[PDB]
Amino acid sequence: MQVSVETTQGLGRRVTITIAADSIETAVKSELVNVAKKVRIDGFRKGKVPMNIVAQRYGASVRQDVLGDLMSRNFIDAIIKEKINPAGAPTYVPGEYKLGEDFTYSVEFEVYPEVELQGLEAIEVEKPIVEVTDADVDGMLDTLRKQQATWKEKDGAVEAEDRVTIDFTGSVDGEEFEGGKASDFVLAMGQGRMIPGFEDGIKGHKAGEEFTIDVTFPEEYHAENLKGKAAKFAINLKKVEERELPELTAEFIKRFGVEDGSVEGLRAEVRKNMERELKSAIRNRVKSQAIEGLVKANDIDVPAALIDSEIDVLRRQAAQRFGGNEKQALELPRELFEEQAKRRVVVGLLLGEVIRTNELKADEERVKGLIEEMASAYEDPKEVIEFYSKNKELMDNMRNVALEEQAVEAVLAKAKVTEKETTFNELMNQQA
Amino acid sequence: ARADVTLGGGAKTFAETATAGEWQGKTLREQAQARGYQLVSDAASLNSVTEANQQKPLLGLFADGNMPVRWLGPKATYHGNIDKPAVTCTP
């Protein structure tokens, strides 16, 4: 077979495999002699009729069945000895198939380029040394009690995070709009629920006065013609309602799993659990910043096939979360996925090369290390590990994270890891 | 199909009314939250478990981890198919 290496699309190389009649008529005949044995007709076939008659004439139908066998096995054989590693998927352009003439087929497939790595030492990646200090423990428990607090109607004073009842009436931008009028209205202030500034109109007051404030709607508001407007509302201040914190009695605290009534056990619980989640969160934190700076400091063209693959995974995931559409997503606007997908494969090529050079792997002791730290933190490790190894969707995720961690940390060994000391609040103060 | 046009304007005039995200905590709705009350007593927390490290997942949607067996998400993968040699060819 005459094979080429026609580097047409740069990434796209064309190995035009020209299988001559010597390999055609033998490989077709390999199946034909097996058909006789498979149906046991070979026992009845005396061999009087030479195979050539039943190969070209009677086997003419079967020559079609051998086309895929020729295209598949002779391709994978060729590219290995030609030292050409493919990427994505190969496109077979079958020139012609005839007896006597050559089965010529131009297999156009994309390959990996020379992955340009630069400034990998110049990349400054932040390392937040986050932990659950006593400030974070008390803060955590207090927040839990405030979020699960029972609303107790009081009088006298508005606190910054209370639930205040008013009657407000007016117009937005001096024009009739809905939402600028609500009788017996109630506001859990200090909470991301209403305009910061609307609540502050009330917060500069006590119980049962009457006034009028101008609220400037934020540029954070997705409401296109409201964002940055000034509305005039006559706030009839009625009552206040305290977020009265619930109990922490034996039957309450055990219901969450903390079998001991001692609060120090729930403090210990917050420490061991939130750090179990935290190490994974800090790994993904330093990871995402490293990847951001890696690609921001580096450039590499991706094979279109790989971009198509990532886009397609995003289309399936999109349609699934949009309603549950089966393959309709193939029509979704490619440019919505194009940039981010290609960018994620740029990550895969840059990490691909630093991995290759530093001979990295899905480290068995790392996978298993994280499997023990995972499973032991639950009720029953046994069935979680059994379920895990069989849940290929998640067992994949375990290989992928281990490899991605080691991949990034090989770049961190090269990169300027700017380490800082900070509390568990750090991880939570990530809005935008 | 020809081309069914269903576009009912948009009505982005006064969007995100908000209403302070609150008008439920008024006696009636907290009964629906408290509807059940008694669940999982025991002397301990059901002693048929290997360990009580965290038998009941009290931890919610706090950044990453969460407790439910899934977590994580951001990956890259592929590279050059260097992955642990135990893979089903399933596209």
Chain-chain contact of A348 with B58 (C-beta, under 8 angstroms): no
3-state helix/strand/coil string of A266-335? HHHHHHHHHHHHHHHHHHHHHHHHHHHHHHHCCCCCCCHHHHHHHHHHHHHHHHHHHCCCCCHHHHCCCH
Chain A residue numbers touching B20 (CB-CB < 8 A): 185-189, 193-194
In chain A, which residues are followed by a C-to-N distance beyond 2.5 Å, i.e. a gap?
none
Which helix (H) or strand (E) is A104 found in, with range? strand A103-111
Question: Which A residues, 36 through 75, put their C-beta within 8 Å of a C-beta on chain B?
Answer: none
> With b meaning 16 or more CB within 10 Å and e meaning fewer, what string describes A366-392?
bbeebbeebbebbbbbeebbeebeeee
Which of B14, B76, B84 lies at the smallest CB-CB distance from A178? B14
Task: Look at residues A213, A209, A215, A198 and name the one whose alpha carbon lies nearest to residue A238.
Answer: A209
Cα Rg for chain A, rounded, in angstroms?
34
* Residue that is written with structure tokens 């304007």 in the block: B9
CA dist A130 → A28, A83, B59 (Å): 67, 47, 18
Burial classification of residue A325, based on how many CB atoms lie within 10 Å of its CB (0-12 exposed, 13-18 middle, 19 or more buried): middle
Contact A103, A18 (CB under 8 A): yes
CA distance A417 to B37: 50
Strands A124-131 and A416-423 come out as: parallel
Task: Tell me if A1-110 shares its fold with A111-149+247-432.
Answer: no
Chain B residue numbers touching A280 (CB-CB < 8 A): 64-65, 71-72
CA distance A187 to B25: 11
Chain-chain contact of A281 with B76 (C-beta, under 8 angstroms): no
- The side-by-side arrangement of strands in the sheet containing A12-19 is A6-9, A12-19, A103-111, A86-96
Nearest chain A residue to B64 by CA distance is A281
Chain-chain contact of A362 with B62 (C-beta, under 8 angstroms): no
State the count of interchain CB pairs (< 8 A) between A and B: 184
Q: How many CA atoms lie within 13 A of A317 on its CB side?
A: 9
Token pair for A175: 């024009």
Determine the residue among A186, A379, A395, A423 to mutate to test chain B binding: the one whose Cβ has the most chain B Cβ atoms within 10 Å.
A379
Token pair for A27: 């490989």
3-state helix/strand/coil string of A342-384? HHHHHHHHHHHHHHHHCCCCCCHHHHHHHHHHHHCCCCCHHHH
- % helix / strand / coil in chain B, to the nearest 5? 10, 0, 90
Q: CA of B29, closest CA in chain A: separation in Å? A: 12
Amino acid found at A307: I
β-strand partners of A212: A234
Contact A431, A132 (CB under 8 A): no
CA distance A198 to B19: 11
- % helix / strand / coil in chain A, to the nearest 5? 45, 20, 30
Task: Look at residues A293, A355, A290, A299 and name the one whose alpha carbon lies nearest to residue A113.
Answer: A299
Nearest chain B residue to A344 by CA distance is B76
Burial classification of residue A354, based on how many CB atoms lie within 10 Å of its CB (0-12 exposed, 13-18 middle, 19 or more buried): buried
Contact A173, A185 (CB under 8 A): no
Chain-chain contact of B78 with A288 (C-beta, under 8 angstroms): no
Amino acid found at A384: V
Which of A112, A223, A273 lies at the smallest CB-CB distance from B16? A223
- Please provide residue A390's backbone torsions phi and psi, each rounded to the nearest 5 degrees: -90, -20
Chain B residue numbers touching A345 (CB-CB < 8 A): 78
> Angle A396-A398-A399 (CA atoms, 0-180°, nearest 5)?
65
CA dist A145 → A16, A140, A187, A244, A314 (Å): 70, 9, 19, 9, 39
Identify how the structure was determined.
NMR
Q: Where are the domains of chain A?
A: 1-110, 111-149+247-432, 150-246
CA distance A12 to A303: 8
> With b meaning 16 or more CB within 10 Å and e meaning fewer, what string describes B17-53?
eeebebeebeeeeeeeeeeeeeeeeeeebeeeeeeeb
CA distance B36 to B48: 24
CA dist A109 → A15, A432, B80 (Å): 8, 41, 15
CA distance B71 to A384: 14
Chain A residue numbers touching B78 (CB-CB < 8 A): 306, 345, 348, 352
Chain-chain contact of A194 with B82 (C-beta, under 8 angstroms): no
Q: CA of A104, closest CA in chain B: separation in Å? A: 28
CATH of A1-110, one of 3.40.50.1000, 3.90.420.10, 3.30.470.20, 3.30.70.1050: 3.30.70.1050
CA distance A427 to A281: 8
> Angle B51-B55-B57 (CA atoms, 0-180°, nearest 5)?
145
Amino acid found at A217: F
Contact B45, A259 (CB under 8 A): yes
Contact B52, B45 (CB under 8 A): yes
Q: Assign domain A111-149+247-432 to a CATH class.
A: mainly alpha
CA distance A389 to A416: 37
Amino acid found at A320: Q
Cα Rg for chain B, rounded, in angstroms?
25
Q: Where are the domains of chain B?
A: 1-91
Tell me, yes or no, if A392 comes closer than 8 A to chain B by beta carbon: yes
CA distance A234 to A213: 7
> Angle A132-A138-A144 (CA atoms, 0-180°, nearest 5)?
100
CA distance A268 to A274: 10
CA distance A56 to A131: 76
Nearest chain A residue to B11 by CA distance is A223
CA distance A350 to A116: 8
Torsion sign (Cα): A164, A165, A167, A170: positive
CA distance A24 to A100: 9
CA dist A12 → A6, A80, A112 (Å): 8, 17, 9
Contact A137, A267 (CB under 8 A): yes
Chain-chain contact of A399 with B83 (C-beta, under 8 angstroms): yes
Burial classification of residue A157, based on how many CB atoms lie within 10 Å of its CB (0-12 exposed, 13-18 middle, 19 or more buried): exposed
Task: Look at residues A430, A401, A422, A380 and name the one whose alpha carbon lies nearest to residue A133.
Answer: A422
Task: Look at residues A346, A340, A347 and name the one whose alpha carbon lies nearest to residue A404.
Answer: A347
* A167 SS3 class: strand
CA distance A198 to A160: 12
CA dist A418 → A122, A125, A129, A242, B14 (Å): 12, 6, 11, 44, 46
CA distance A301 to A114: 9
Chain A residue numbers touching B61 (CB-CB < 8 A): none
Question: Span A150-246: which CATH code?
Answer: 3.10.50.40
CA distance A351 to A404: 8
Torsion sign (Cα): B44, B49, B50, B56: negative
CA dist A170 → A194, A231, A235, A413 (Å): 17, 7, 9, 60
